[PDB]
């Protein structure tokens, strides 16, 4: 089998500064096939004057050999 | 009063036009060190600001275009077209409205063997606003005006050093935008205000120094400057009426100043980065600007 | 890496926890009848920054206050 790899999920990091909402913060990732380990991992979050959000998620698709998937996530927000 | 809000309407539109007007080495791509004479260039910007009296606004304009040429006897004459779309929204003490401005036009570029840079663009746009104002009792209304604006820019970047060189530059855009005519007779009194076709023009002379860095470890575009902006033509004259009588007003020239941007750098073709500057001059007329800073990393 | 489509879209949404006789003049919001429609062109490009999506369409049908952004742009 000959395959050609492609990109999958990518990093970002944005700190937006202004007069309204001030220096709002934001960053995170969202990618499956984590480093080739085959997982699916996504972390994101933003810091704002009146809106703070964060979410973390992981999912292993082949937890057992047969193919059962074990996944979970957490999320927090205040607006 | 209501008439004074019209001056703010033009002054706010002036900043949007000042936001619409930009550089040629950013919006139209660097006229030098571009080996693809057949291809596209673009730039998208977003910002906000306000003035004294609570008048605030936020806008974002994105333009793209293409050009196609080949090598000549020392001159980099290229021609092509472009389009642009801008959105803005503003609020004041007694009025507020949102607007858009989309246009299309043609551009030419010229880089000479002696190191000169020249750009020219020209666009016809159909800018439409929808705003509510109770001053003069008129109410809420939407109107579209056609802007035929052509702007040129010239400069001479002399190779002072292979990584740092002083650049003189001067730009100017002249446009025709017709005025508006409306009466508040729906409220009972005419108070008719009319303005015919206007032919404004504004330029800016800026002296800049730019750095040529490479190697993909820096790969930055560190360039700074100082510029003075003068409204070459301000024909935004409007004549309003009332039961007591009728008055007149018109746009006036400017002598504004400006500043520069910090880093605007990148690492490789996979990633990107930049930094922006918000020139917030509260001392002049409670003026302000808005900026941003954000990069990308992709596996 | 590029993919263009011509699309025709239809959509609707409503509530069941609604009464109309309680609000004669206030318009009903429980009628599966206001079926909004749109048509246009869309483009996708897997750029070396992600799946960039652009679209331009017109809402051939609309109701009430349905402010429309004609040209849409997003990633993923």
From Swiss-Prot, chain B:
Protein origin, superkingdom: Bacteria
Membrane topology according to the record: Multi-pass membrane protein
Residues in Autotransporter domain copies: 33-299
Site positions for Cleavage: 22-23
Cellular compartment(s): Cell outer membrane
Name of the protein this chain belongs to: Autotransporter protein EspP translocator
The species this protein was found in: Escherichia coli O157:H7
Gene designation per UniProt: espP
First-to-last residue of the parent protein present: 1002 to 1300 of 1300
Curated annotation (Swiss-Prot), chain C:
Record annotation: effect of changing residue 69 to L: Very minor growth defect. Lethal
Record's subcellular location: Cell outer membrane
Extracellular side: 15-36, 59-72
Topological domains, Periplasmic: 47
Summary of the knockout phenotype: Deletion is lethal. Depletion results in the accumulation of incorrectly assembled outer membrane proteins, including TolC, OmpF, OmpC and OmpA. Decreased expression leads to decreased susceptibility to contact-dependent growth inhibition (CDI), and decreased expression of outer membrane proteins (including in this study LamB) as well as up-regulation of periplasmic protease DegP.
Top-rank lineage group of the source organism: Bacteria
Transmembrane segments: 2-14, 37-46, 48-58, 73-76
Domain remark from Swiss-Prot or TrEMBL: Contains 5 N-terminal periplasmic polypeptide transport-associated (POTRA) domains which interact with other subunits of the complex, may recruit substrates from the periplasm into the outer membrane and also act as a chaperone. The C-terminal region forms a discontinuous 16-stranded beta-barrel transmembrane region. The central pore is ellipsoid, and probably closed by extracellular loop 6, perhaps with the aid of other loops.
Assembly mode: Part of the Bam complex, which is composed of the outer membrane protein BamA, and four lipoproteins BamB, BamC, BamD and BamE. BamA interacts directly with BamB and the BamCDE subcomplex. The Bam complex has the shape of a hat, with the BamA beta-barrel crown in the outer membrane and the periplasmic brim formed by the BamA POTRA domains and the 4 lipoproteins.
Similarity comment text for this entry: Belongs to the BamA family.
Function: Part of the outer membrane protein assembly complex (Bam), which is involved in assembly and insertion of beta-barrel proteins into the outer membrane. Constitutes, with BamD, the core component of the assembly machinery. Efficient substrate folding and insertion into the outer membrane requires all 5 subunits. A lateral gate may open between the first and last strands of the BamA beta-barrel that allows substrate to insert into the outer membrane; comparison of the structures of complete and nearly complete Bam complexes show there is considerable movement of all 5 proteins. (Microbial infection) Acts as a receptor for CdiA-EC93, the contact-dependent growth inhibition (CDI) effector of E.coli strain EC93; antibodies against extracellular epitopes decrease CDI. Its role in CDI is independent of the other Bam complex components. Is not the receptor for CdiA from E.coli strain 536 / UPEC, which does not have the same mode of toxicity as CdiA from strain EC93; the decreased expression of bamA101 in some experiments decreases the level of outer membrane proteins in general.
Protein name (record): Outer membrane protein assembly factor BamA
Organism in which the protein naturally occurs: Escherichia coli (strain K12)
Residues of the full protein shown: 732 to 807 of 810
């Amino acid at each position: 089998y000959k395959v050609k790899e492609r990109n999958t999920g990518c990093f970002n990091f944005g700190i937006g500064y202004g007069t309204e909402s001030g220096v709002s913060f934001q960053a995170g990732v969202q990618q499956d096939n984590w480093l080739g380990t085959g997982y699916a991992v996504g972390i994101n979050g933003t810091k704002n004057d009146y809106q703070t959000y964060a979410e973390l998620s992981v999912t292993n698709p082949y937890f057992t050999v047969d193919g059962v998937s074990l996944g979970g996530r957490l999320f927090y927000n205040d607006f | 009063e209501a008439t004074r809000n019209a001056a703010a309407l033009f002054s706010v539109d002036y900043k949007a036009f000042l936001n619409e007007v930009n550089n040629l080495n950013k919006r139209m791509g660097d006229l030098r060190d571009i080996n693809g004479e057949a291809g596209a260039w673009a730039r998208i910007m977003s910002g906000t600001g306000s003035a004294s009296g609570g008048f605030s606004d936020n806008y974002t304009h994105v333009q793209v275009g293409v050009d196609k040429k080949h090598e000549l006897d020392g001159l980099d004459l290229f021609t092509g077209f472009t389009v642009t779309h801008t959105d803005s929204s503003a609020s004041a003490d007694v009025f507020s409205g949102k607007t858009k401005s989309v246009g299309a036009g043609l551009y030419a570029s010229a880089m000479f063997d002696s190191g000169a840079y020249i750009d020219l663009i020209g666009k016809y746009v159909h800018h439409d606003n929808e705003y509510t104002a109770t001053f003069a009792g008129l109410g809420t209304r939407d109107y579209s005006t056609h802007s035929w604006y052509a702007g040129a820019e010239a400069g001479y970047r002399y190779h002072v050093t292979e990584d740092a060189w002083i650049e003189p530059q001067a730009e100017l855009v002249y446009g025709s935008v017709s005025g508006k005519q409306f009466a508040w007779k729906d409220q009972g009194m005419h108070l008719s205000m009319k303005d015919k076709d206007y032919n404004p023009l504004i330029g800016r002379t800026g002296v800049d120094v730019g750095k040529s860095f490479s190697g993909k470890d820096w790969k930055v575009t560190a360039r700074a400057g100082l510029g003075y902006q003068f409204d070459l033509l301000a024909n935004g004259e409007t004549v309003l009426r009332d039961a007591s009588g009728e008055k007149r007003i018109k746009g006036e020239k400017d002598s504004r100043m400006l500043m520069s941007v910090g880093l605007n750098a990148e690492i490789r073709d996979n990633v990107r980065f930049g930094l922006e500057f918000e020139k917030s001059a509260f001392g002049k007329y409670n003026v302000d600007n808005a900026v941003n800073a954000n990069f990308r990393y992709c596996f | 890496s590029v993919r263009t489509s011509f699309f025709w879209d239809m959509g609707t949404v409503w509530d069941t926890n609604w009464d109309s006789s309680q609000y004669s003049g206030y318009p009903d919001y429980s009628d599966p009848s206001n079926i909004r429609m749109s048509a246009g062109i869309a483009l996708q490009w897997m750029s070396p920054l992600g799946p960039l999506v652009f679209s331009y369409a017109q809402p051939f049908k609309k109701y009430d206050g349905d402010k429309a952004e004609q040209f849409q742009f997003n990633i993923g």
